[PDB]
Curated annotation (Swiss-Prot), chain A:
This is Glutamate receptor 2. One of its GO terms (biological process) is response to lithium ion. The postsynaptic actions of L-glutamate are mediated by a variety of receptors that are named according to their selective agonists. This receptor binds AMPA (quisqualate) > L-glutamate > kainate. GO terms for cellular component: AMPA glutamate receptor complex; asymmetric synapse; axon; cell surface; dendrite; dendrite cytoplasm; dendrite membrane; dendritic shaft. Residues 117-261 are extracellular. The lineage of its organism: Eukaryota, Metazoa, Chordata, Craniata, Vertebrata.
Amino acid sequence: KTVVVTTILESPYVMMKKNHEMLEGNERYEGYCVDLAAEIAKHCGFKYKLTIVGDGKYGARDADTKIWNGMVGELVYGKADIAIAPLTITLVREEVIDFSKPFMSLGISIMIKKGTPIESAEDLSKQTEIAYGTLDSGSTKEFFRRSKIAVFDKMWTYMRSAEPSVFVRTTAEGVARVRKSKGKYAYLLESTMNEYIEQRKPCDTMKVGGNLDSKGYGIATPKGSSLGNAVNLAVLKLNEQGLLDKLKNKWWYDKGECGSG
Amino acid sequence: KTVVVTTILESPYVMMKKNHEMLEGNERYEGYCVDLAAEIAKHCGFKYKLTIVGDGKYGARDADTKIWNGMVGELVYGKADIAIAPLTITLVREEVIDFSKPFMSLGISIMIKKGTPIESAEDLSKQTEIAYGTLDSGSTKEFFRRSKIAVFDKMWTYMRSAEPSVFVRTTAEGVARVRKSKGKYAYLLESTMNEYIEQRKPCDTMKVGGNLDSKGYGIATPKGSSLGNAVNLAVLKLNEQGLLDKLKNKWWYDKGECG
Ligand SMILES: O=S1(=O)NCN(C2CC2)c2cc(CCc3ccc4c(c3)N(C3CC3)CNS4(=O)=O)ccc21
Ligand SMILES: [Cl-]
Ligand SMILES: [Cl-]
Ligand SMILES: [Cl-]
Ligand SMILES: [Cl-]
Ligand SMILES: [Cl-]
Ligand SMILES: [Cl-]
């Protein structure tokens, strides 16, 4: 009766230990969600096996085939019992799996190369010298496409037509583009990743301004799962004990490479 | 039948309209949670009656009688169908009712009278000239009592023995104490209330420093309610539509008095 946990290789949530081939089972992995999985299992009284999602994806429903991919797909098609990963709580996912209460907060944020004269989305929207963009697919692009807020609508009208294209295929390319564009590119991405990169060498990026929306990561279990209630309560217990803040500090700042300000 | 909504008179969530005595039913009330109730009702397809919780409390279990008071009590004992209020998501409440996903974020924050040389909890912890405290019961006090974080442990060690007492019986008293202590008291309270008061005349308070923890308000229904799932999805839809942010800006900043 070992619980099958699906998760995803994304730093600092789940990472392969360099000597993983000499280790076995859950010991092959380390990270924020590795620690969280252990805490959840302890407070719910189950043993578990960590597995990495087969297709490396989070969870989206292909509009044509109507098939779920990623960790959500592994839940609804019965390949895993629970997903413990940086999986954003969204309406479409909530329809098909049960999300625990959030274990981490996040929102759209701005990444600049140190020295860029930008403090806010409003700053971005009122100037043209500094290009800015998003991942070419996903929720951040759609946030701007759909927004009725004047500043964000102005940003969307700019980004949708900017040339050369301000959209990037991957988060890594957005980050690289900030680092290599000599201050002439700002990247819009989730605050959690932005904060993580701010603590990575070469320590040349910064998160600026407040978050543009409010989201969270949640643990996912299939509907009717015998684990759902206990996991949900475990998340709240961990927060009230300060352990979620403790874990984020550990993996973002204690293990950071750029010191303080 | 008509859905019975229990809520609480707390500005700006639910307030009596100025002319409420001329009005009946749901029209007597205005505020963030009045607007949220209408949106939830619309997206879940029910009609509803707003009611103010009889005992004026949020929801706690008496350790001796084991009886739940407040809005949580009204749900578990069958007096109301749903609570739409600034009800903090907590473990012990989640054990007895169903919380929707959070519809507003909040965390512990610091309120000062403008001019007080305090910018952070760390600032508070290093001195005693400016007294500081919390509500005398509830989660903010317990956050400090239980913290193993050095700065917060230092603050607790001060607050627990400070004389005269730095604890207050009500949130209103904490706010009033800030305003009336001539710059010598700072109050630890939820960021949402701190932000609200900062936008109210006489515009003499300020929110300073980052939040000390991360919580949220949730809508509550009794376990097994036919409304739970629909309400939960409705909160996420409203968030993804930007409507929760729009409503907060409406009631905190558009209707603010301090520029
Ligand atoms: O997509 S949501 O579910 N819906 C919409 N919103 C917006 C407010 C409207 C949010 C906002 C957040 C951040 C604030 C928040 C709320 C509740 C809790 C939090 C953190 N924690 C903390 C560890 C992070 C623990 N458990 S908890 O008590 O439930 C997360 C998820 C969502
Ligand atoms: Cl990675
Ligand atoms: Cl091993
Ligand atoms: Cl310019
Ligand atoms: Cl606007
Ligand atoms: Cl009436
Ligand atoms: Cl510490």
